[PDB]
Amino acid sequence: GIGGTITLVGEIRLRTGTRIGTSEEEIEIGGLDNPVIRDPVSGYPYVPGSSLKGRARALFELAWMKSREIEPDVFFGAHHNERHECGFVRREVYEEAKEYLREDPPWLENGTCPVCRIFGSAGDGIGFSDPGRLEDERRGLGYDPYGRYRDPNDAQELSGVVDVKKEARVAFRDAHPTTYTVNDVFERAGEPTEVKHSMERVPKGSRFGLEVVYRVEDGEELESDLKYLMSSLKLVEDQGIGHSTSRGYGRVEFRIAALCARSTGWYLDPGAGEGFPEEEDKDEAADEVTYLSDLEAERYEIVIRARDLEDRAYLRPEEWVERLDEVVGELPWGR
């Protein structure tokens, strides 16, 4: 593998202001999904890591599906139109399943599923190895859409191969407002106030700390994962961290100042350390990445700064993608 982590560090800037929370009514009618909620502890609005991850996953899986022109029946299976889950999460699974495949599942790349391997999966949620479920009208699609990919008679064999849970390679830290956001942005607007345990709103320009941790598991999929992870963040930028019935809700920017890497080997000799954010990083960033001033420096093996790649304090998700060859070359994986 071997293991260890790559940590994205920066902040989320809102391009638009938002309400805090939702309502019983909107929740009932199936309308406004708003991830920005009140923190019982601090009393300030924040964006839970799980909500960011969920949103990034929901948008990426759709983009992945359409980019490969896959019919939703095939892509979502028994889940119909959302939450794609498959067990093709490691190359072993595909090699092991290849004998029973008439044709490659179209959402696969080099034998594995980017959606599920990155954002996790409960297993064979789409029911790829469960034709009985698929063909049932109430429990499935009323037919088997996977005929061309596998014989329904080989499903029970597949069911011992392709139905394995996978823990997500990415984890999002709860995004709380930065000190700048509390002392300046919130103060300038007179809202929101400290309301521990609407009619207050989160002003446009508000900034929430961004930490995203990616677990390196497969060196061969490292760069590809980073591309898709960044891409999912780009999608969240374009479509919002939340949504109403009609359009996106909560326009955001992911201002990513650095990629911070720690390999398993490095834990044996921590002293070979690059710190982030250091004082220099803080002077270079804020006012552009305000979260850095709230942070004490942490020890990493290698720190890739936006400043190393470009005359910038931060790069946006799509900008990191364009320079990923350059980035991965400097990381302690792939020799």
**Binding pattern to Zn ion, positions 89-128, x when CB under 5 A?**
------------------------x-xx------------
Residue 162 near Zn ion by CB under 5 A: no
Q: Which two tokens stand for residue 262?
A: 């720690």
Q: Are 313 and 289 in contact (CB under 8 A)?
A: yes
What are the DSSP calls for 130-142, one per residue?
Answer: -HHHHH-TTTS-S
The answer on whether 260 is annotated among ligand-binding residues is: no
Nearer to Zn ion, 47 or 162 (CB): 162
Query: Which residue(s) pair with 177 in the sheet?
Result: 208
The DSSP secondary-structure symbol of 276 reads E
CB of 119 to Zn ion, least distance (A): 9
The answer on whether 116 is annotated among ligand-binding residues is: yes
For Zn ion (CB under 5 A), the number of binding residues is 4
CB of 99 to Zn ion, least distance (A): 20
Nearer to Zn ion, 76 or 100 (CB): 76
- Binding segment for Zn ion among 80-88, 94-102, 268-276, 285-293 (CB under 5 A)? 80-88
Q: Are 304 and 262 in contact (CB under 8 A)?
A: no
Q: Which residues contact 20 (CB under 8 A, 6 or more apart)?
A: 36, 37, 38, 45, 192, 198, 200, 201, 202
CB of 228 to Zn ion, least distance (A): 12
233: helix, strand or coil = helix
121: helix, strand or coil = strand
> C-alpha 148: how far from its chain's center?
31
DSSP H stretches of helix in the chain:
24-29, 49-67, 72-76, 91-97, 114-119, 131-135, 155-158, 179-180, 186-189, 222-239, 279-284, 306-309, 317-322, 324-329
The answer on whether 86 is annotated among ligand-binding residues is: yes
CB of 247 to Zn ion, least distance (A): 28
- Binding segment for Zn ion among 81-89, 214-222, 234-242, 284-292 (CB under 5 A)? 81-89
Query: Which residue(s) pair with 303 in the sheet?
Result: 260
Nearer to Zn ion, 47 or 65 (CB): 65
Q: Are 65 and 113 in contact (CB under 8 A)?
A: no
Residue 86 near Zn ion by CB under 5 A: yes
Nearer to Zn ion, 162 or 236 (CB): 162
CB of 320 to Zn ion, least distance (A): 24
- Binding segment for Zn ion among 26-34, 85-93, 95-103, 204-212 (CB under 5 A)? 85-93
* Degrees to nearest 5, angle at CA 243 with 47 and 112: 80
Report 35-64 residues binding Zn ion (CB under 5 A). none
Nearer to Zn ion, 165 or 188 (CB): 165
CB of 33 to Zn ion, least distance (A): 23
CB of 133 to Zn ion, least distance (A): 17
Nearer to Zn ion, 155 or 302 (CB): 155
Q: Are 198 and 191 in contact (CB under 8 A)?
A: no
Nearer to Zn ion, 163 or 211 (CB): 163
Binding site feature residues for Zn(2+)? 84, 86, 113, 116
Binding residues: 84, 86, 113, 116
Residue ranges that bind Zn ion, judged by CB under 5 A: 86, 113, 115-116
